Write a protein that binds this DNA or RNA. Sequence first.
DNA 1: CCTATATAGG
DNA 2: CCTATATAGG
Length: 66
Amino acid sequence: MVKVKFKYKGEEKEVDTSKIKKVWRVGKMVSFTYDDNGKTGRGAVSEKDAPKELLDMLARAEREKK
DNA sequence: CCTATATAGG
DNA sequence: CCTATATAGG
C-alpha cells in the first residue's frame, strides 16, 4: 500500500497512509498525525516529497472544508 | 541560532 | 506552555 517516509528524531521512519488521522500545510511543509499503534504519532515531509495520496488527503482536508 | 508558521496532545 | 516537523529569512 502507499507509504510516507519522514524524519523523526534524526531517523527515517515510514507509515502507511491509511494510518494518517489529519494532514495540513505549513508553507511548503506538510505535517500530519497518525495512529501509531494505539497512540498518536506525528510526522512531516516536504511538499515535493509527499506521495500523491497524502497530497489528496491534504487537498481534501482544506480544499474540502472551505 | 532564532523566531515563526499549523497543529495536536491527558 | 512545550515540543516536533521543513522552510524562511518577515
